[PDB]
Amino acid sequence: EAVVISGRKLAQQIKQEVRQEVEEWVASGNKRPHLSVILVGENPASHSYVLNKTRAAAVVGINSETIMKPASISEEELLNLINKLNNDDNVDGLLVQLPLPEHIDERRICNAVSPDKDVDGFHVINVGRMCLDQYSMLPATPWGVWEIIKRTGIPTLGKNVVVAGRSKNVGMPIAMLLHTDGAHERPGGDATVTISHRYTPKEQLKKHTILADIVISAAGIPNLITADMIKEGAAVIDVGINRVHDPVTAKPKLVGDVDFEGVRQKAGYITPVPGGVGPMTVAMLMKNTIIAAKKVLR
Amino acid sequence: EAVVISGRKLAQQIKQEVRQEVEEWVASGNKRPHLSVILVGENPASHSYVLNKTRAAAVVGINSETIMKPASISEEELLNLINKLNNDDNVDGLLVQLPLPEHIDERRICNAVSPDKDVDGFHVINVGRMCLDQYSMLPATPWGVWEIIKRTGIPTLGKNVVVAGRSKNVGMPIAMLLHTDGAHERPGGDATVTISHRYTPKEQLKKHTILADIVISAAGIPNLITADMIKEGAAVIDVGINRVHLVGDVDFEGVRQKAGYITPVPGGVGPMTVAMLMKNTIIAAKKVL
Ligand SMILES: Nc1nc(=O)c(CC(=O)Nc2cnc(C(=O)N[C@@H](CCC(=O)O)C(=O)O)c(F)c2)c(N)[nH]1
Ligand SMILES: Nc1nc(=O)c(CC(=O)Nc2cnc(C(=O)N[C@@H](CCC(=O)O)C(=O)O)c(F)c2)c(N)[nH]1
Ligand SMILES: Nc1ncnc2c1ncn2[C@@H]1O[C@H](COP(=O)(O)OP(=O)(O)O)[C@@H](O)[C@H]1O
């Protein structure tokens, strides 16, 4: 039966580390780090998630604010705000919670944020640098997945890894980190990586996961991954956060992409949803904010 | 036996497309495109390849010059030259042939070329845009591999593909093009892609290639792919160009029984590399950023 990795405990340890580091930075008489978060509209998940981020900033010694804007705001208005904050020498990190409404182009917004305040790592320069194995602001969810693997001592060099999902801020950067050279400026995990997506036929997915020492599911599909697909002792990391309705009572429940109960038999490791990858995302963003405050990637 | 794909012939087709496009463009008022190539040192592969590029330029009606410099050139000189060429409005495309001498930072050189004139697609912005499936200057070898697959009619959507190698200008971009979404601004092939490299155990490689409708080898290792690694009827694309006693990364002679399609070396991907660069030069001349 599978060791269950608590991403909540790990995230909490990492927050303690950022706390000490912020205490230190300030005791040396530096400006306290400041994170600004922009939230557009009323997606409830977006609200909960931004709540989690600002709390985390509070508890690790980072000053936060959330600027909430109505969904009817124009792209131009959002850009004027971004520009104010890029020019405010008090703001170390600046993030815009996603998704944005359809009249606003996310890519133009992500590229408007100053690369050295880009704690999400979504600016095209950060994406380019990451894809070239250079130092960059790494994106929080993928770096969280990496820390779960690395801090649990699960090896990656030479190993087979499958990532279900190819989204530009989750699946793609996860696949990039895991396959790349450990000897490079930004080290990778030297694994053999397969990437699947919405057109991977389910039988062919299974044919690749069955060979996998590590399966990382970032598709947003309940019960995508089941124990017949996993091999004995493999690590299984679950990036999905899927809001379902619970058969016994149609209560609103969070599952991931893995059939936890089925897979926790056969697997060597497993993360739960909730309390797995999600809090790690919040922890790695605290890390990026301290990094941005210390202006080390200038 | 396997259908042997002629890169020589597909490249001919592409170069005729560019010739026509260039001729309409000049005919309708515009400056004739110009490609400037910077060559440093005496690597015989580099010299041969830069000659192939400028010949192709000449025959599709694109003006060229190669600027040859000694290996001894300093990084500051090379950047000075690049800066001059970035400002010369006669120059549409600018490329610096690799590899550069060990005392020159390649990445610094690559980022110094104006993105508008970056016909190799090695500038960090071009790499970033490509990884986001945005319009970009696609790198020549990866776009060549893509054109080989799509002009030969080999399907990719839902299919299994293995790329052997993860170099930033070949193997990584090939994997990026093949797995990405056909509906995006810069379409991809909607395939299921495995990337392998110098730490993939050979048996594990084989366990992936066995499943593969397409195997693309960009490792630079003679005989890495052998017919027991292929599944019958599969497309094998050989990006390797190795000096031994020129051959690929495939055992051509063996794999051609088992394979559905196969590319030779020479005459496969290499001539396509040259062709796609001509494509990129006319795209740069037209200033469709
Ligand atoms: N600019 C930008 N950047 C981004 O990074 C992201 C991604 C992101 O914020 N992800 C998450 C994920 N999970 C949590 C979390 O708290 N998860 C808990 C459950 C809490 C509950 O159910 O409400 C868990 O999974 O246990 C979080 F705070 C943030 C977006 N959308 N936008
Ligand atoms: N900035 C930059 N950009 C780059 O794109 C490249 C890569 C590159 O130039 N690739 C190639 C590959 N092959 C050929 C070729 O003509 N191959 C013939 C064999 C001819 C013979 O040497 O006898 C074949 O394979 O049939 C070519 F002209 C260029 C580099 N290095 N640098
Ligand atoms: N056994 C192997 N299987 C797959 N890829 C390999 C193997 N051995 C080496 N490689 C890869 O080949 C590449 C060598 O780089 P390079 O020669 O610069 O690229 P190219 O083949 O495009 O010229 C590296 O990415 C390396 O990890």
Numbering used by the authors:
A (entry chain B): 36 to 333
B (entry chain A): 36 to 280, 289 to 332
Published text:
The tool compound TH7299, as well as two of the most promising candidates, TH9028 and TH9619, were chosen to investigate the MTHFD2 mechanism of action and cancer biology. Furthermore, we determined the cocrystal structures of TH7299, TH9028 and TH9619 in complexes with human MTHFD2 to assess their binding mode and identify critical interactions in the binding pocket. In the present study, we show that, in contrast to the characteristic promiscuity and polypharmacology of antifolates such as methotrexate (MTX) and pemetrexed (PMTX), TH9619 displayed high selectivity toward binding and stabilizing MTHFD2 over other common folate metabolism targets such as dihydrofolate reductase (DHFR), thymidylate synthase (TYMS), serine hydroxymethyltransferase (SHMT) 1 and SHMT2. We could confirm MTHFD2 stabilization against thermal degradation on incubation with TH9619 in cell lysates and live cells using CETSA, demonstrating intracellular target engagement. To evaluate whether targeting MTHFD2 was responsible for the observed toxicity on MTHFD2 inhibitors in cancer cells, we generated MTHFD2−/− clustered regularly interspaced short palindromic repeats (CRISPR)–Cas9 knockout cells and found that they were several orders of magnitude more resistant to TH9619 than parental MTHFD2 WT cells, but not MTHFD1−/− cells. TH9619 shows very good solubility and metabolic stability in combination with low plasma protein binding, but also poor passive cell permeability that is probably explained by the low lipophilicity (cLogP: −2.25) and large polar surface area (239 Å2 (23.9 nm)), suggesting active transport over membranes, probably via folate transporters and/or receptors. Furthermore, TH9619 was comparably potent against mouse MTHFD2 (half-maximal inhibitory concentration (IC50) of 66 nM), indicating that mice could be used as a model for safety and tolerability studies.
The folate metabolism enzyme MTHFD2 (methylenetetrahydrofolate dehydrogenase/cyclohydrolase) is consistently overexpressed in cancer but its roles are not fully characterized, and current candidate inhibitors have limited potency for clinical development. Indeed, the one-carbon metabolism enzyme MTHFD2 stands out as the most consistently overexpressed metabolic enzyme across human tumors. MTHFD2 enzymatic function supports rapid cell proliferation during early embryogenesis, after which it is replaced by the mitochondrial protein MTHFD2L in healthy mature tissue.
